[PDB]
Amino acid sequence: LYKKAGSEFALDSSKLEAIYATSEADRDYKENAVDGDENTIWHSAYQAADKLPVSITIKLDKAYDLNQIDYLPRQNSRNGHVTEYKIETSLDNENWTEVRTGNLEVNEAGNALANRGYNPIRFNTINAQYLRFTALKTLGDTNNKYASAAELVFYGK
Ligand SMILES: CC(=O)N[C@@H]1[C@@H](O)[C@@H](O)[C@@H](CO)O[C@H]1O
Ligand SMILES: [Ca+2]
């Protein structure tokens, strides 16, 4: 029911730009969520007053008909693994449509995502030049405080 990385629709990460994120920590910048690279992450701040939700806004080079993104969790650590999320889109970065909400399954222990590769998230084909991805629940040494993402893969025409 999903599509894999070899969909004719998989936008190239060169098409994407992270224009905004609630916060960023260390050297884990918003740009690392859409650089096509498993080995870089976006991580949000984890100071004392930092809590969820956090979100990141991806700008596309034109407006696309999107119907799926893949979420690639941080490969070396479960810190910031997103387990509940929200997806919104817009043409103008001011008026958002709420596309959907949802969860990703945890492993047996409950300490990391069950699927450590591309977790596909499909939705009904909507036209967009901006997508806001919002982490609602997350894992980490402290749960539900900070989020990370290794990649967001977009699909659309
Ligand atoms: C190298 C590394 O893992 N750094 C993490 C950091 O990204 C963040 O998750 C922080 C919050 O607890 O924990 C650190 O250990
Ligand atoms: Ca990356």
Residue numbers in the entry: 6 to 162
Quoted passage from the original study:
The molecular determinants of galacto-specific sugar recognition displayed by CpGH31 CBM32-3 were revealed by the X-ray crystal structures of this protein module in its apo-, galactose-bound, and GalNAc-bound states, which were determined to 1.58 Å, 1.48 Å and 2.50 Å resolution, respectively. The galactose and GalNAc residues were well-ordered in the crystal structures of the CBM32-3:Gal and CBM32-3:GalNAc complexes, respectively, and provided clear electron density, allowing for monosaccharide modeling into each structure. The galactose and GalNAc coordinating amino acid residues of CBM32-3 were conserved, and included Tyr1674, His1671, Arg1702, Asn1707 and Tyr1774. The b-face of both sugars formed CH-π interactions with Tyr1674, while a secondary aromatic residue, Tyr1774, whose side chain is perpendicular to that of Tyr1674, mediated additional hydrophobic interactions with the C6 group of each sugar. Galactose and GalNAc binding was further stabilized through a series of polar contacts formed between the side chains of His1671, Arg1702 and Asn1707 and the C2-C3-C4-C5 edge of each sugar. Specifically, hydrogen bonds were observed between Asn1707 and the O4 hydroxyl and endocyclic oxygen, His1671 and the O4 hydroxyl, and Arg1702 and the O3 and O4 hydroxyl and 2-acetamido groups. The orientation of galactose and GalNAc, and the respective contacts being made with the CBM were consistent with the STD NMR data, in which strong STD signals for the apolar α- and β-H3, α- and β-H4, α/β-H6, and acetyl group protons were observed. Alignment of the three CBM32-3 structures revealed minimal sugar—induced structural changes (backbone r.m.s.d < 0.22 Å) and only subtle differences in B-factors associated with the variable loops were also observed.
As part of the secreted C. perfringens CAZyme arsenal, the bacterium possesses an open reading frame coding for a 220-kDa family 31 glycoside hydrolase (locus tag CPF_1301 in strain ATCC 13124) with predicted α-glucosidase activity, which will be hereafter referred to as CpGH31. In addition to the N-terminal glycoside hydrolase family 31 catalytic module, CpGH31 comprises two fibronectin-type III modules, three CBM32s, a putative cohesin module, and a bacterial immunoglobulin-like 2 module. Though the putative CBMs, referred to as CBM32-1, CBM32-2, CBM32-3, themselves are not closely related at the amino acid sequence level, a primary structure comparison indicates that they all belong to CBM family 32, an observation that is supported by their overall similar structures as determined by X-ray crystallography. Each CpGH31 CBM32 structure comprised the β-sandwich topology characteristic of this CBM family with a short α-helix and a calcium ion capping one side of each module.
